[PDB]
Amino acid sequence: CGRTSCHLPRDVLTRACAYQDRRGQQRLPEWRDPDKYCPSYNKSPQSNSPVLLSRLHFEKDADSSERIIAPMRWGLVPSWFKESDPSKLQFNTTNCRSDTVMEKRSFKVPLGKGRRCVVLADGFYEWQRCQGTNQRQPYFIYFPQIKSPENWEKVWDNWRLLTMAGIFDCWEPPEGGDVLYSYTIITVDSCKGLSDIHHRMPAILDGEEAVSKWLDFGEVSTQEALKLIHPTENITFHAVSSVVNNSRNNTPECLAPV
DNA sequence: GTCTGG
DNA sequence: CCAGACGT
DNA sequence: GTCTGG
DNA sequence: CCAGACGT
């Protein structure tokens, strides 16, 4: 799970993230670094994607059930990394297996500080391996949706964003600069629905109960939080063209059916 | 910064 | 103890 | 075969 | 994730 779509204009994304805090107040998440939001049909690791995180990570004495939305770097850069440039990292932090997460140096420390985030996406791409061919079929995978320029605009207004369990860390560049916020997406075993595409899938949080508990490092311990991490069958997909393959291709044809 | 392997 | 990794 | 850049 | 380089 090393590609996503996140193409929505920023205000349309923000209205799709309407939530209720613990007191039942209908809110929209507050932005940090909105200028780093770069919408694209074709997001790879080392790009920025919007994530939800608890207000309490940014504001002292905050309601931990309130939400911030911020761009973060896809590919976790641990706090301790010593080189000048994030891209010199000699290990893969695009994903984080759920089974091993407590034993992994890169993920344990930040998960232990409550650095739990929710990665937003239209949906994600997976490439299917088939016996005795090097050819790979790309699929676009997304939450079931409520079933022409008027058809398109209506669908994307009423789109249910995919909400994926992530962990994030903060890194002060040694040479100097703004603190880097970076995230990994947690993986689990694929469900029956997806098993013929790929043996591994992102940890999907299905519904506002699950999203809220994962965000709320105020009231919800790591042990309680890890119980939300599992496959889901509440998932659909269709085959897409080879246009997605090259990350430089940012167009609607990326997630168009064939 | 922390932890495993030697 | 220190060296060396730290991940999919 | 492996790794960086996108 | 895949594309594309891989060197003086």
Q: Is residue A126 among the annotated active site residues?
A: yes
Nucleotides of C under 7 A from a protein CB: 5-8
Is the CB of residue A183 less than 8 Å from the CB of residue A76?
yes
Whether nucleic acid strand C comes within 7 Å of the CB of A187, the answer is: yes
Distance CA A42, CA A253 (A): 10
Resolution of the solved structure (Å): 2.2
> What contacts 24+ positions apart, CB below 8 Å, involve A186-189?
A186/A95, A186/A96, A186/A97, A186/A98, A186/A101, A186/A229, A187/A1, A187/A95, A187/A96, A187/A97, A187/A98, A188/A98, A188/A229, A188/A230, A188/A231, A189/A231
Chain-centroid distance of CA A122 in Å reads: 10
Q: Please give the Cα distance from A221 to A205 (Å, whole number).
A: 16
Strand B nucleotides within a 7 Å radius of protein CB atoms: 1-4
Mention every residue, 6+ apart, whose C-beta is less than 8 A from residue A197: A126, A128, A139, A141, A190, A237
Strand partners, A128: A137
Phi-psi region of A31 (alpha: psi -120 to 50; beta: other; left: phi over 0): beta
The closest nt to A88, taking CA to C1', is D4
The greatest distance separating any two alpha carbons of chain A, rounded to the nearest whole angstrom, comes to: 58
For residues A61-95, one letter each, b for 16 or more C-beta atoms within 10 angstroms of the residue's C-beta and e for the rest, the string is eebbbbbbbbbbbbbbbbbebeeeebeebeeebbb
| Look-up of token digits 């911020």 | A70
Angle (CA) A77-A198-A257 rounded to 5° is 100
* Cβ-proximal residues to A91 (8 Å cutoff; 6+ apart), any chain: A106
Distance, C-alpha A7 to centroid of its chain: 13
**Which residues have C-beta within 8 Å of that of residue A157, sequence separation ≥ 6?**
A12
Active-site annotation holder among A6, A66, A117, A126: A126
Q: Which of A233, A200, A244, A166 is nearest to A1 (CA)?
A: A200
Q: Is the CB of residue A141 inside 7 Å of nucleic acid strand C?
A: no
Task: Identify how the structure was determined.
Answer: X-ray
Q: Are A167 and A98 in contact (CB under 8 A)?
A: no
| Length A45 CA → E7 C1' (Å) | 27
Q: How far is the CA of A231 from the C1' of D1 (A)?
A: 33
Strands A136-142 and A116-121: unpaired
* Residue A58 Cα distances to A64, A120, A149, angstroms: 10, 19, 40
Query: In A172-258, at which residue ranges do the beta strands (DSSP E only) sit?
Result: 180-189, 200-202, 236-239
**Planar angle of CA A44, A48, A54, nearest 5 degrees:** 125
Q: Which residues of A160-180 are buried (b: 16+ CB within 10 A; e: fewer)?
A: ebbbbbbbbbbbeeeeeeeeb
Report CA A120 to chain centroid distance, whole Å.
5
Out of A1, A17, A117, A254, pick the active-site residue: A1
For A87, phi then psi, to 5°, come to -75, -5
Q: How far is CA A10 from the centre of its chain?
A: 16
CA distance A243 to A169: 33
CATH at A49: 3.90.1680.10
Residue A6 near residue A121, CB atoms below 8 Å:
yes
- Which residues, at least 6 apart from A25, have a Cβ–Cβ distance to it below 8 Å? none
Distance CA A10, CA A252 (A): 17
How many domains are contained in chain A? 1
A1 as an active site residue: the answer is yes
State the burial class of residue A116 (Cβ atoms within 10 Å of its Cβ: 0-12, 13-18, 19+).
Answer: buried
Residues of the domain holding A243: 1-258
Q: Which residues touch strand D (CB under 7 A)?
A: A 2-3, 44-46, 87, 90, 247-248
